Amino acid sequence: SFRFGQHLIKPSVVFLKTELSFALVNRKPVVPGHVLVCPLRPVERFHDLRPDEVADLFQTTQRVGTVVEKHFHGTSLTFSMQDGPEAGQTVKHVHVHVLPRKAGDFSWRSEEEMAAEAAALRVYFQ
Amino acid sequence: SFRFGQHLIKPSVVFLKTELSFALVNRKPVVPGHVLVCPLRPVERFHDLRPDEVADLFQTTQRVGTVVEKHFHGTSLTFSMQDGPEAGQTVKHVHVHVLPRKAGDFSWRSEEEMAAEAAALRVYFQ
C-alpha cells in the first residue's frame, strides 16, 4: 500500500498519513512504541525533500511522538534520523525513528500484531 | 546575544539565524562539525513549538546539515534530538545535533577558535 524504500508497507501497519508523510509501526522496534515517520515520496537523502515535505515530515513527527510517548507511557522521546550510508541508513528512504523514553529505560512481530499496535495508535489521531 | 536554555551564546559563535531559529557551533563537538540547531524561543520540549517553529527548525536543519557535511567533508549526516530528561536532554531547550559522517568515522574550544569555525560557516549561507 505505502512505499518505503523498496518494500511495500500494508496500510494495516500504517497509523497516520498526512498530506505529504506517513507513519508506521516497526517490524522490530528497538523499544516499545519505536515507530518511524517517513515522507511519502521515496528519496534517500534529507537534502532531497522540498521545503514543504520537510515542514510536513517534522510537524507529523511532533504529533506522533506525543502519541507514542502517551500510549506507551514514556516521559521523554528520542528522535533520530540516520541520513545516509555512513550514518546508518539501511533502507534508503528518509525516515525519523521516534522512540518513547522511560526512567532508566535503557524481536519480530506478526503482520497481525503490528496490525494491532497500528489500530491502537490510529485512535489518538482524531 | 542568543538565549539557549540558561546560557547566553555570543553571536560570534552563531553562524545562522532565521526567522524563528538559530544555529551554533559546539563548545565540545562529539565529532568535527558537530553543530546544534535550536528554536530562538526557549522551550524545553518539542511538543511546545507551534507548528511554524517546527517547519522552521527543521528546514534550517536541512540547510545547516548540508553545509557542515560539505565544509567538514562527510558523506552522510546524523540528526538527533534528545527530547526530554529520560532521553538525554541536559540543557533544557529544544535542540537538534547535526554531526557530519565519514567512511568508518566512528575537547573544549576557545571563544575565539569557535568564533573561527563560525565565520567559516557563515560563508556558505549567502
A111-122 and A51-71 helices cross at what angle (nearest 10)?
100
Reference B75, options A105, A4, A28, A82; nearest CA is A82
Closest partner CB to A84 (pick from B51, B75, B87): B75
Chain centre to alpha carbon of residue B100: 12
Distance CA A61, CA A77 (A): 11
The three-point CA angle B37-B43-B49 to 5° equals: 80
* d(C-alpha B80, C-alpha B55), whole Å: 16
Residues whose CB falls within 8 Å of the CB of residue B81, separated by 6 or more in sequence, listed in order: A78, A79, A80, B46, B94, B95, B96, B97
Q: Which H or E run contains B40?
A: none
Angstrom distance (rounded) from CA B45 to CA B86: 12
Partner-chain residue, chosen from B47, B79, B88, that has the shortest CB–CB distance to A83: B79
> Quick one: cell of A48?
532531497
Distance from C-alpha of A119 to C-alpha of B21, rounded to nearest angstrom: 36
Q: What is the DSSP letter of B20?
A: S
- The CA distance from B112 to B115, in Å, is 5
Chain B residues in contact with A103 by the CB 8 A cut-off are 86
CA pair distance A37, A26, nearest whole angstrom? 10
Chosen from A58, A89, A90 to mutate, greatest number of chain B CBs within 10 A: A58
Structural domains present in chain A: 1-126 (3.30.428.10)
A27: cell is: 517490524
Q: Does B70 touch chain A (CB under 8 A)?
A: no
> Which residues have CB under 8 Å from A20's CB, separation 6+?
A39, A40, A41, A52, A53, A56, A57
Solving technique: X-ray
| C-alpha–C-alpha distance, residues B50 and B33, integer Å | 28
Residue B50 CB partners (closer than 8 Å, separation 6+): none
Q: Grid coordinates in use for A84?
A: 545516509
* Other beta carbons within 10 Å of A60: 23
Residues A101, B86: C-beta atoms closer than 8 Å: yes
Q: Binding site annotation covers B90?
A: yes
Question: Within an 8 Å CB–CB cutoff, is residue A106 touching chain B?
Answer: no
Distance between alpha carbon A60 and the CA centroid of its chain, in Å?
A: 10
Question: Which residue does chain A place closest to B103, by CA atoms?
Answer: A86
* Cβ-contact B102, A86 below 8 angstroms: yes
Alpha carbon distance A123, B6 (integer Å)? 38
Could you tell me which residues come within 8 angstroms of residue A113 by beta carbon, excluding any fewer than 6 positions away?
none
CA distance B63 to B1: 22
| Catalytic residue ranges of A | 95
Give A6's contacts (C-beta < 8 A, 6+ positions apart): A91, A92
